[PDB]
Amino acid sequence: SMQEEDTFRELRIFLRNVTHRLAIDKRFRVFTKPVDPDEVPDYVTVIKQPMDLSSVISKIDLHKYLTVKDYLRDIDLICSNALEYNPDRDPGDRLIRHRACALRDTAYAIIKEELDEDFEQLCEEIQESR
Numbered sequence: 600s601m602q603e604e605d606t607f608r609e610l611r612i613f614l615r616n617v618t619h620r621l622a623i624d625k626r627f628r629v630f631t632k633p634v635d636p637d638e639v640p641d642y643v644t645v646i647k648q649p650m651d652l653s654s655v656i657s658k659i660d661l662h663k664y665l666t667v668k669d670y671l672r673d674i675d676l677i678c679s680n681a682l683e684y685n686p687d688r689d690p691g692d693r694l695i696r697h698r699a700c701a702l703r704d705t706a707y708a709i710i711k712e713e714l715d716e717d718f719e720q721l722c723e724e725i726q727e728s729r
């Protein structure tokens with residue numbers, strides 16, 4: 600219905616806002632663009648499901664997220680990919696893992712505080728009815 604299209608549009612507006620606040624954070628600059636296969640040739644082979652904040656933005660506009668759960672799945676994916684690909688004890692790896700976890704935590708914290716549970720519930724029930 601027209602009412603349901605309004606709900607998903609509100610969701611997309613909310614998700615764009617959250618993602619923008621993550622993307623401008625200097626700690627998360629590394630997660631703002633896809634991995635360059637030139638600088639990093641073995642990434643695409645090791646990480647089967649690449650994800651970054653620019654791709655998240657693209658998926659929002661393509662109406663790929665009907666719930667915040669769908670959205671958070673991709674956020675978690677950005678984090679889990681970073682932990683998997685950079686697992687060593689060296690400072691370089693430990694820094695990006697720390698930043699990855701901070702990205703995940705920040706996203707969840709923003710949503711915990713600003714997302715209405717009834718709004719999310721409505722999104723889920725509309726989604727489950729399709």
Ligand SMILES: CC1(C)CNC(=O)c2sc(N)nc2C1
Pocket residue numbers: 629630631632633634638639650651680681684685695
């Ligand atoms: C450090 C880098 C070159 C490779 N290792 C990574 O974890 C990622 S994930 C991403 N979106 N960019 C990079 C850049």
Ligand SMILES: [Cl-]
Pocket residue numbers: 613713714715718
């Ligand atoms: Cl909301």
